[PDB]
Symmetry: none
């Protein structure tokens, strides 16, 4: 078994590398998260077993704008602006 | 077994690399998430078993705009703008 | 078993590296999180067993804007601005 | 078993490295968190067992803005500004 | 078993390194946290067992702004400003 990555580099690059090797167990190597809203996750073992009265209401209001100039997209010789 | 990636580089590139090798177990290598809304996930083992009264209402209001100049798309010699 | 990454570098790069080797257990190597809102997570073992009255309301209001010039995207020779 | 990273460097780079080796257990190597709001986490063993009256309300108001010039994205020869 | 990182360096770099080796248990090597608000965590063993009346309200108000010139992103030859 031989694994070789990026033996020689002369210029000035910008590089993201992730090498995983498994031989004979979870993992997250590059993760980004924005505005994650999850309610009532993994709610116990036996809740609300016999009798329950629940008023579930959720409110998040307002004009929401998302601007991304680049999502998973590098450049080499470029100009990028978000006015 | 021999695996070789990017032996020699002379210029100045912008590179994203992910190498996985399995030989004889989950994983997320590049993940991006925006505005994920999941309600009542993995709700216990035996909830609401016999009698239940649930009022489930969800409200998220407002004009929503999403602008992405590039999603999974690199450039080499370009100009990119989002006015 | 031989694993080699970035043997020789001459210029002045900007590099992110993560190497994982498993031989015969979780892990997070690069994680970023912004505005994560999760309510009632892993709620005990047996809560609200017999009788319960719950008024669940959640409010987060206001115009919300997110601007990202680059998400997982390096540059080599560029100009980037967010006015 | 042989693992070699960055044998020789001559210029002046800016490098982030994380090497993990497991041979035959959790861990977080690079973590960043901004505005994490999680209510009622790991709530005891058996709370609210028989009778309960709960008024759950949450309020966080105001225009909220997030500006990030770069999230997981290095540069080599660039200019970056956020006016 | 042989692990070698950064054998020789001649210039003047800025380097962050974390090496972990396990052979046959938790840990946090690089952690940053800003504005973490978690209420009622690990609430006893059996609180609020039989009868309870709880008024849970939370208020944090005001326009909130977050500006980050770089999050997990080094430079080599750059200029960075946040006016």
């Amino acid at each position: 078994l031989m694994v070789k990555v990026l033996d020689a580099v002369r210029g000035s690059p910008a590089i993201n590398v992730a090498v995983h090797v498994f031989r004979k167990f979870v993992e997250g190597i590059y993760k980004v998260e924005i505005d994650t809203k999850s309610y009532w996750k993994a709610l116990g073992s036996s809740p609300f077993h016999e009798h329950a009265e629940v008023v579930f209401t959720a409110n998040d209001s307002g004009p929401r704008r998302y601007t991304i100039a680049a999502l998973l997209s590098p450049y080499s010789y470029s100009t990028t602006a978000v006015v």
